[PDB]
Amino acid sequence: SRIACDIDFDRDGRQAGYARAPLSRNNSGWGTVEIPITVVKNGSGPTVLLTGGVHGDEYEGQIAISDLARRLRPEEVQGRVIMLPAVNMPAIQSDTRLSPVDGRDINRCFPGDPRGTFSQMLAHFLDSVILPMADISVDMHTAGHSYDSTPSTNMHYLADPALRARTLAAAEAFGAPHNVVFSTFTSCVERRGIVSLGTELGGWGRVNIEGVRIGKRGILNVLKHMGVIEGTPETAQRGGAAGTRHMMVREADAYVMAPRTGLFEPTHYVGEEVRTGETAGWIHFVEDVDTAPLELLYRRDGIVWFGAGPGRVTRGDAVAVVMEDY
């Protein structure tokens, strides 16, 4: 790896610093991008890795994790916490999913190429240098500009029933209203046999207040679950529920796709209950006089996990992803 980092991850105490990722530009051939990293190590216990900003426009983890990284102290800690709140820095500056450097979706570039373009090199550092240190990974996402999402965690239905149990338990600990079992960074975590949670904590290009609340509590809840900091998870839900309701997305049927490009009007938001064969929304063809909207229907019973982001949708886009009980 060409990405330089001087942090001693074996050292007791707190270190807050940067990994320095080389970046060549026309007027800065030897330029660097500074990726914030904080590590708190003390006492005895497991390593929790918290990442945010893998996509530049996904704010909730950037906020939750940098806030924690400023405040967390060695004497609060039994084990180790590694925090990278803002991984894809170039993309964070442009507030986009894709890299303004090489156009790549970094979360389609793992495990990476140490000699590749920026996103490939960064993917490689993450998977090869940072990740092997982790006992558990929480990679914090939202839908960015693509959809809204109802605050939630997510995981894969694992082969190993033991690992499957631990990830479920960690997700219950995290305590979002829902947990959804479903070349990404998470594919790397899973391939190394490390427990893997992701989150979906908003979107619509905006900051989700409830998403931030849920995500800040979530990462503390995981540190408590893992016994890295004192206490037990606070998992109470605003509509009365005492904890996380497990869900799944396994069926082509769970997706409402747009057949044509146009202006899509939805009938429901995320978190709302929906049933099969009924109206999901209409694609209006505002370009035409007289022409009637094209009705879309859900083809699943369940609840809306992702709902329509941009008003103007392109053929091939999902306008809704419906989740159902696990």
Applying CB under 8 A, does 103 fall inside the site for its own copies? yes
Q: Mark residues 21-60: x for contact with its own copies by CB under 8 A, - for none.
A: --xxxxxxxxxxxx-xxx--------------x-x-x-x-
Among the listed residues 48, 190, 317, 322, the single contact to its own copies using CB under 8 A: 317
Ordered alpha helix ranges (H), 30-137: 60-71, 89-94, 118-125
| Residues in contact with its own copies, shown as a per-residue x/- string from 153 to 192 under the rule CB under 8 A | ------------------------------x---------
Stretch that binds its own copies, among 152-160, 188-196, 222-230, 312-320 (CB under 8 A): 312-320
Name which of its own copies, Ca ion, none residue 287 binds, using a CB cut-off of 5 to 8 Å depending on partner kind: its own copies
41, 80, 104, 141: which one binds Ca ion (CB under 5 A): 141
- Give the nearest distance from C-beta 21 to its own copies in angstroms: 9
Kindly list the distances between the CA atom of residue 91 and the CA atoms of 58, 72, 108, 295, in Å, as whole numbers in the listed order: 10, 26, 14, 36
Q: Which residues, numbered 279-308, are part of the site for its own copies (CB under 8 A)? A: 284, 286-293, 308
The CA-atom distances, in angstroms, between 231 and each of 12, 54, 92, 98, 169 are 22, 29, 33, 38, 16
88 Cβ contact list (under 8 Å, min separation 6): 53, 54, 55, 56, 99, 106, 119, 122
- Looking only at residues 125 through 144 of this chain, which bind its own copies when binding is defined by CB under 8 A? 143-144
Pairing of strands 13-25, 79-84: unpaired
> Is position 86 an interface residue for its own copies (rule: CB under 8 A)?
yes
Confirm or reject binding of residue 309 to its own copies (CB under 8 A): yes
Using CB under 5 A, count the residues that bind Ca ion.
3
Query: 156 among the known binding-site residues?
Result: no
- 104 touches its own copies (CB under 8 A): yes
Q: Is 58 labeled as ligand-binding?
A: yes
The strand ranges marked E within the chain are 13-25, 28-42, 47-52, 79-84, 136-141, 147-149, 152-155, 178-181, 195-200, 245-248, 255-257, 262-266, 273-274, 279-284, 294-297, 302-308, 312-313, 318-325
Q: Is 253 in the site for its own copies (CB under 8 A)?
A: no
- Is 141 known to sit in a ligand binding site? yes
What angle in degrees, to the nearest 10, is found between the helix axes of 209-225 and 161-174?
130
Residues present in the chain in total: 326
Number of residues forming the site for its own copies (CB under 8 A) = 86
Closest approach, Cβ 165 to its own copies, in A, equals 28
Q: Among the candidate windows 127-135, 164-172, 192-200, 314-322, which touches its own copies by CB under 8 A?
A: 314-322
Close Cβ partners of 65 (under 8 Å, ≥ 6 residues apart) = 50, 51, 52, 83, 84, 85, 140, 219
By a kind-dependent CB cut-off of 5 to 8 A, residue 175 interacts, out of its own copies, Ca ion, none, with: none
Spell 268-288 as b/e; 16+ CB within 10 A means b. Answer: bebbeebeeeeebbbbbbeee
Query: Which CB atom, from 40 or from 84, has the smaller least distance to Ca ion?
Result: 84
Q: State the nearest-atom distance from the C-beta of 297 to its own copies, in Å.
A: 17
Token pair recorded at residue 50: 């918290």
| Residues in 18-77 that interact with Ca ion by CB under 5 A | 55, 58
Under rule CB under 8 A, which residues in 186-205 are in contact with its own copies?
Answer: 204-205
- Angle, vertex CA 65, rays to CA 107 and CA 179, nearest 5: 65
Footprint of Ca ion (CB under 5 A)? 55, 58, 141
State the binding site for Ca(2+): 55, 58, 141
